C-alpha cells in the first residue's frame, strides 16, 4: 500500500509486539496468589492490553516494518479517521473558545471599569456568552460581511516606521 506499508492485521511484526507485551505481564503475574489485589490488577491490565491490539487490527491502520501504526495525512478520505475527522473536531472546539472569549472582551469594554471584569469575572454574563459559540461559523461569518470583524486602518496605533 501507500509507502510500501502493510495493514496492521496482516503485519507479522505487529503480531509479535502483541505477544511480547502479554508475555511480559504474565511473567509478572505468576508471583502472586490468584484472588489477591495484585493478581486482579495485572489480569485487568492484560485484558486492557489485549483489547488494545484487537482494536487496531480491525481499525484499518497501516503498519511498517517496525510493527507500529502509522498515520496518513495526505488528504486521503480512506484514512479520514486519522486526521480529518479529529481535525474538524478540534477546529470546532478551538474556534468556539476564541469566539466566546472575544465576545466577552467586547461586551465589558463599554463600561466604567473594563479591567475590573477581567480579574473578577461577571460569571452570570460569562456563562451566558460561553454557550453562544455553538454556532460560531455562522456568527463569525455574519460579522465578516458586516464590518464588525476587522477594524479600519485608521484605528490601529502603528510604530513610527509605518
Partner 1 sequence: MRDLKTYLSVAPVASTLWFAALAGLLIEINRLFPDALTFPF
Partner 2 sequence: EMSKAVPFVKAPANTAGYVGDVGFDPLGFSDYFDMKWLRESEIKHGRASMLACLGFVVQQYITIPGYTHVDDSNLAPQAVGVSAMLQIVLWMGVLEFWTNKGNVTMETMFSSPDRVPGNLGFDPMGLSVGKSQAEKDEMALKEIKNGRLAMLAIGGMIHHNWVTGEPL
Ligand X SMILES: CCCCCCCCCCCCCCCC(=O)OC[C@H](COP(=O)(O)OC[C@@H](O)CO)OC(=O)CCCCCCCCCCCCCCC
Binding span for ligand CLA by CB under 6 A among 9-17, 58-66, 92-100, 148-156:
92-100
Nearest one of 103, 111, 118 to 149, comparing CA atoms: 103
Q: What is the crossing angle of helices 136-144 and 84-107, to 10°?
A: 60
For position 62 contacting ligand CLA by CB under 6 A, the verdict is: no
Within positions 124 to 153, which residues make up the interface with partner 1, using CB under 8 A? none
Which residues in 98-157 contact partner 2 (CB under 8 A)? 124, 127-129, 131-132, 134-135, 139
Residue 73 binds to ligand X (criterion: CB under 6 A): no
Q: Which of 95, 109, 106, 104 is nearest to 139 (CA)?
A: 95
137 binds, among ligand CLA, ligand X, partner 2, none (CB under 5 to 8 A by kind): ligand X
Task: Kindly list the distances between the CA atom of residue 65 and the CA atoms of 4, 52, 53, in Å, as whole numbers in the listed order.
Answer: 9, 19, 17
Chain residues in the site for partner 2 (CB under 8 A): 124, 127-129, 131-132, 134-135, 139
Amino acid at each position: 500500500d501507500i509507502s510500501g506499508l502493510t495493514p496492521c492485521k496482516e503485519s507479522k511484526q505487529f503480531a509479535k509486539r502483541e505477544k511480547q507485551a502479554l508475555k511480559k505481564l504474565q511473567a509478572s503475574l505468576k508471583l502472586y496468589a490468584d484472588d489477591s489485589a495484585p493478581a486482579l490488577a495485572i489480569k485487568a491490565t492484560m485484558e486492557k492490553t489485549k483489547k488494545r491490539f484487537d482494536n487496531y487490527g480491525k481499525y484499518g491502520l497501516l503498519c511498517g516494518s517496525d510493527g507500529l501504526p502509522h498515520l496518513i495525512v495526505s488528504g486521503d478520505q480512506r484514512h479520514w479517521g486519522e486526521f480529518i475527522t479529529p481535525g474538524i473536531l478540534f477546529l470546532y472546539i478551538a474556534g468556539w473558545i476564541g469566539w466566546v472569549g472575544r465576545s466577552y472582551l467586547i461586551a465589558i469594554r463599554d463600561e466604567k471599569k473594563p479591567t475590573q471584569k477581567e480579574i473578577i469575572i461577571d460569571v452570570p454574563l460569562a456563562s451566558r456568552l460561553l454557550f453562544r459559540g455553538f454556532s460560531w461559523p455562522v456568527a463569525a461569518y455574519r460579522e465578516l460581511l458586516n464590518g464588525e470583524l476587522v477594524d479600519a486602518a485608521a484605528a490601529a496605533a502603528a510604530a513610527a516606521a509605518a
